[PDB]
Amino acid sequence: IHRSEKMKEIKEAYQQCGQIVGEYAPACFKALSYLPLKQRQASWAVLSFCHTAASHLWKAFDHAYRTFTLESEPFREFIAAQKEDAKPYDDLDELLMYAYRTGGAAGLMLLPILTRRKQDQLKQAAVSLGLAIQLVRFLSDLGTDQQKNRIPRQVMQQFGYTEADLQKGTVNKAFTMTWEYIAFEAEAYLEECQDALPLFPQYSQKTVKAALHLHRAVLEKIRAKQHDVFQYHFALTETEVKQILSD
């Protein structure tokens, strides 16, 4: 087929979007692999955009935008949320609002790609999934001050976890209670998407199911490794993903 140079450039840009996501989000990339090619590549573009903004390729993004009639709002929301705050979060609501504006927004970005019909019925599930995934990522690595800053001071106070403990990266009972209190919320969002799993079209169910299983597994691994998130960034290995996804 004589493809236009423009389309050739779009295909190149998409592949690069896939290289990116595959590198910075192996688990999600794996979950997305179950989508048909058109949807899969579109998802790469959306998440590549997220990664890029969190730290040309627009050709593939515009293509995805026009192909799936994506909405501009969530993309704007995500961008605005990258302007930060060097101050620690106070309320759990503050952390949740943040996960909502980033992960939740990403979930909304992807909605039109995950489903063509029952979008109204699956919107809540998509946002909850993205929100939960962001919470899981947050709970998987507390190595820097920026990450430590997202731990809600009111939650820390509830269990007696001190600023001094946190700065030292001390993993004591007070810390695990703080961590589990936040993990409880993440799991509630996950279960919410789990309940709506049968509503997604067959072409995207394996992708949603994979995402759900993978992130639940991440939380379990962290627990298995004694919540040692101040020292290591937790992620599933290729071997682990394979087992989780064996079905």
Curated annotation (Swiss-Prot):
Keyword Hydrolase set for record: yes
Disruption phenotype: Loss of biofilm formation. Loss of a dark-orange pigment from cells, alteration of cellular lipid profile. Significant reduction of proteins found in detergent-resistant membrane (DRM) fractions. Decrease in membrane fluidity, about 30% decrease in protein secretion.
A GO molecular function held by the record: 15-cis-phytoene synthase activity
Enzyme class: hydrolase
Keywords of the record: Hydrolase
EC annotation from Swiss-Prot or TrEMBL: 3.1.7.6
InterPro entries: Isoprenoid_synthase_dom_sf, Squ/phyt_synthse
Regulation of this protein's activity per its record: Diphosphate release from FPP is inhibited by zaragozic acid.
Record's catalysed reaction(s): (2E,6E)-farnesyl diphosphate + H2O = (2E,6E)-farnesol + diphosphate
SUPFAM superfamilies: Terpenoid synthases (SSF48576)
Family: Belongs to the phytoene/squalene synthase family.
Complexes and interactors: Monomer.
Function per UniProt: A farnesyl diphosphate (FPP) phosphatase. Involved in biofilm formation, its disruption blocks biofilm synthesis which is restored by exogenous farnesol. Releases diphosphate from FPP, was initally suggested to be a squalene synthase. Diphosphate release is higher from FPP than geranyl pyrophosphate (GPP) or geranylgeranyl pyrophosphate (GGPP). Biofilm synthesis is partially restored by exogenous squalene, beta-carotene or retinol. Required for integrity of cell membrane lipid rafts.
PANTHER family the UniProt entry points to: BIFUNCTIONAL LYCOPENE CYCLASE/PHYTOENE SYNTHASE (PTHR31480)
Record's protein name: Farnesyl diphosphate phosphatase YisP
